[PDB]
Each structure stands twice: as structure tokens, then as C-alpha cells.
Amino acid sequence: RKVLIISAGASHSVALLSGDIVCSWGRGEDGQLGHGDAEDRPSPTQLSALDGHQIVSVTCGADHTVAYSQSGMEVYSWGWGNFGRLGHGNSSNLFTPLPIKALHGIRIKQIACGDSHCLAVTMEGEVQSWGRNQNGQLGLGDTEDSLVPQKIQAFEGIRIKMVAAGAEHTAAVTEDGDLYGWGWGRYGNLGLGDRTDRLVPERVTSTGGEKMSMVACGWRHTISVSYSGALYTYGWSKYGQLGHGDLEDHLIPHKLEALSNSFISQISGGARHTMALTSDGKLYGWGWNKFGQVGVGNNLDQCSPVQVRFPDDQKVVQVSCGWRHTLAVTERNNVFAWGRGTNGQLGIGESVDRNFPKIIEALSVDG
């Protein structure tokens, strides 16, 4: 019963557990939960179709989910199908997982989903993308949607470490630490200096001197971390989601100085909030907080990082933001949720908003 991976989208939440079990909950009416029907589930619900497929990761886009198995060399997807986001060669919704034929046999390193597009990194550092491409977020050269995966040629030669997908933009880091951005850019969230879209990856030259190790994306903002553990945000800060103690927008990465003492080892981007996990198990939240999603016990927005408190200060080992809610796994193998819960995405049975971490009993040691 070790909770291994957590992911969250617009109104649903999925989890991989030890023993080869996927759980999903939240909004089900577009098929995002993968149980063969369109019913919402306010408690974690085992996804029987994936029992024993030896899944190793799960990732949510806004209204779909993607899973993959390394031993089976098989990627699966389900949920809302419009614009090709499920990658099956059509735009049909799917209420049960189905393998993406195009990726069978591919050795997958990582998958990232946005509102309507996805990206796979292979173990050899190439990247394929599919889904909505209206603002160039597939990174392939134009604004034509792709219902199946196509390789990003611009990265020929370059080995990609990690990708992240926001609403309509994309970001990536190479093995060498270069930082890239493409897609919708109106809000500066690509890090390039301007407000113009890019149809292929363009390299972020202004990285504060530093090689970058990870990336993460919200609706209109981007987060990046450097090899030294320093955190950088860029894009829209109307709700404080850039975390700099103001509401200024930034068109290039901007170091978050209040955290410059800490080593960030994991970042996540919600719609208009941000989560940063330090190497020592402290979870800092900020941004939009109308539904409680920052986890600091009130419903006031936060333009500076605030620590999310857990019982007996047990340390957080993993965090994932949905649009309007947050999920975290602790070292005491507990799972906590907070933010908007009106669709069951918190997984606590009763569908109500919570503004500080509340344990998910179906998945946690404690209660």
C-alpha cells in the first residue's frame, strides 16, 4: 500500500500504488477516471483495467490521464479526446484505458500533459508530442493539431532530460542544462523576453548564469529549478503565482530569492498557484488561494512562498497540483489533499473545499 506517484488535473486525481494498482477519483463525466463509466468518484477508486499491466507512472492533463509500463513497453490513455490529446488517431472520448499504438515498443522516460496536448521523452532523449497545436505547443513547426505522436525535429541531436506542459505552452530542459520554451507566450511564460508564441522550441538564454534541471507549467506561468537548487518563475503573477513578494509579470526567468537558502528538488504548477518541495521535505505554496489550494489555512492569495504544515511536521516526499487543488505524499506514507473539492478531486468522501492539508484515509497509514 505504498503510494508511488500522484498526479492531478482539472477536477480529477490519480495515484499509482505499490503492488501494481492505479487509483483515480474526482470528476468522471468525461471518462478521466477510466473505470468504464462516466460517474464521479469522491474516494480513491481502483482502476481495474490496469491491474497487472505493471504501470510505472501516471500523469493527468486537464481532463485526460496517461499511464505507461516499462516492462510492457506500453502507454495508455483515457478521458476527453478532443483535439487528439489521447494520441489514438481520432478525437473520440475513452472511458477505459487503451494503449497508444504509436508508442508501443518505445522506451519511455517521461510523459507530460497540459490542457489538450502531451509529450513523451524517450530514454534516448528524443521527444514526441500530440494533441492541440493551435499555439504551437507541440513544438513541431506549425499550428496543425496531431492526433498521433510526431517527433520534435528541432531537438535532433539534443538529448532532452525533462519536459513540462501547461495549458497551451511547453517547456523542457536538456541533459546539458539548457532551458527551452514554446507554444502560447502572451504572458511571458516561455522565458524568451517577449509575448509572442513559438512554433518550435526556442532556447532561453537568460537563465541567471545557470544550467537548469527541471521545469513545470501552469495556465500562464512557468517554474524552473537550477543545478544549485535555486528556483525561477516567469509569466503571469496577477494572483502571486510567481512568488516574488509582488504581483509583477516576468518575461524571462526570475530567481525566487526568499527560497535562495533552500534546495528545491521538486516543483509543480497548478492553474494559478505553485508548489516547491525542498530537499529536506518542506513544502512551500503560493499563488491563488480562493479554494484553499495553497494549503496555508485561509482563502487569501499569497504572493510569497508559505510553508504548508502537516501533522507532527512529517516531511513531504512528493507534490502535484491540479488546476485548483493540491496533492502530497509524506514520508510517513500518508497522502494529503486540499483546495477545491466540489467534484471529489480531494478524495475525502465529502466533496467540500479544504484550505489546509487533509488526509486521504483510503490511501494513508494514519487517519
Swiss-Prot record:
Full-protein positions shown: 15 to 381 of 440
Cellular compartments annotated: Nucleus; Cytoplasm, Cytosol
Known outcome of mutating residue 219 to A: Reduces response to UV-B
Main function: UV-B specific signaling component that acts as a UV-B photoreceptor and plays a key role in establishing UV-protective responses in plants. Upon UV-B irradiation, UVR8 undergoes an immediate switch from homodimer to monomer, accumulates in the nucleus, interacts with the photomorphogenic repressor COP1 and regulates the expression of the transcription factor HY5 by associating with chromatin (through histone H2B binding) in the HY5 promoter region.
Phenotypic consequence of gene deletion: Hypersensitivity to ultraviolet-B (UV-B) illumination. Abrogated induction of DHU1 in response to UV-B. Disruption in a plant lacking DHU1 alleviates its hypersensitivity to UV-B.
Organism, scientific name: Arabidopsis thaliana
Keyword Glycosyltransferase set for record: no
GO terms assigned for molecular function: chromatin binding; guanyl-nucleotide exchange factor activity; identical protein binding; photoreceptor activity; protein homodimerization activity
Consequence when changing residue 323 to A: Reduces response to UV-B
Residues in RCC1 repeats: 18-70, 72-123, 125-175, 176-227, 229-279, 280-331, 333-367
Name this protein carries in UniProt: Ultraviolet-B receptor UVR8
Acetylation listed as a keyword: yes
One GO biological process term: entrainment of circadian clock
Alphabetized UniProt keyword annotations: Acetylation, Chromophore, Cytoplasm, Nucleus, Photoreceptor protein, Receptor, Repeat, Sensory transduction
Self-association and partners: Homodimer in the absence of UV-B, but absorption of UV-B induces monomerization of UVR8 and interaction with COP1. Interacts with RUP1, RUP2 and histone H2B.
Effect of residue 25 to F: No effect on function, homodimerization and interaction with COP1
